[PDB]
């Protein structure tokens, strides 16, 4: 049993690495100074629109407007990327591609943002967030100052990230934590729960052992970590409401078809 949980950890870690090119270690280094373009306002945003060439697409929309919009729209590019990376990594969780396709869709639909905010925290410190695969650093204060409702679309994630990073998880820990989140059996509209819960039981055992080996003096880390899953749901449901108020009060800005699918009929 012990050796198999270990092998399962090792495997997920391996796929976690292939699937997400920029890692916590990689990005923690950059942040501690262990040379990124800094975005602090509009001008330095555009001047950093050649940070990684540009967030293009950059279709022939988003190209455009005031700062909050330009940023809101660049956020969708990166988050389509992320959904693909995540989908990819899910396929690698043993047992997952064996599930009903409808169940597979549901798990990803409901778990994707929880994972996006989990992974984003690796990329943050109290003062700002990395972007463009660590080539840019966007300041927190800039992100708040965004006005209409776009302010505080990111402040809550910073607040969560700062607490989450205090747990000081590494990539090996995060690898299994993310697996566990995807294999959540309480997703609305699951067809049959039993096989998903069987897999999670397994990831949970593996996570528990990982925490004990890797963080031997961190008391009740396993518990503290599952408690973060509630923090995470709040951010997700807060985010969704923001989404709903944009799709009305703000002008008709376009949405990537992939995001529309995930967003429609979810809470």
């Amino acid at each position: 049993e012990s050796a198999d949980l270990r092998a399962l950890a090792k495997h997920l870690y391996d796929s976690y690495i292939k699937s997400f090119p920029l890692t916590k270690a990689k990005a923690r280094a950059i942040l501690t100074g262990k040379s990124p373009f800094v975005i602090y306002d509009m001008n330095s945003l555009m001047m950093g629109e050649d940070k990684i060439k540009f967030k293009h697409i950059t279709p022939l929309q988003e190209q455009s407007k005031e700062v909050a919009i330009r940023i809101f729209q660049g956020c969708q590019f990166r988050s389509v990327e992320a959904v693909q990376e995540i989908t990819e990594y899910a396929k690698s969780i043993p047992g997952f591609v064996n599930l009903d396709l409808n169940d597979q869709v549901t798990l990803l639909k409901y778990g994707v943002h929880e994972i996006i905010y989990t992974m984003l925290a690796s990329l943050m410190n109290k003062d700002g967030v990395l972007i463009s695969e660590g080539q840019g650093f966007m300041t927190r204060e800039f992100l708040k100052s965004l006005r209409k409702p776009f302010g505080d679309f990111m402040e809550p994630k910073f607040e969560f990230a700062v607490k989450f990073n205090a747990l000081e998880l590494d990539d090996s820990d995060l690898a299994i934590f993310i697996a566990v989140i995807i294999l959540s059996g309480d997703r609305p509209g699951l067809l049959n729960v039993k096989p998903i819960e069987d897999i999670q039981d397994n990831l949970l055992q593996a996570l528990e052992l990982q925490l004990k080996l890797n963080h031997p003096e961190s008391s009740q880390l396993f518990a503290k970590l599952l408690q973060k899953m509630t923090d995470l749901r709040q951010i997700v449901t807060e985010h969704v409401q923001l989404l709903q108020v944009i799709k009305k009060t703000e002008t008709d800005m376009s949405l990537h078809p992939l995001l529309q699918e995930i967003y429609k009929d979810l809470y």
């Binding site: 693909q84 989908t87 591609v97 396709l101 869709v105």
Partner: peptide
């Protein structure tokens, strides 16, 4: 599976 982009992502 009226999440068709996603169904494809998962469908190899």
């Amino acid at each position: 599976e009226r999440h068709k982009i996603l169904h494809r992502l998962l469908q190899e």
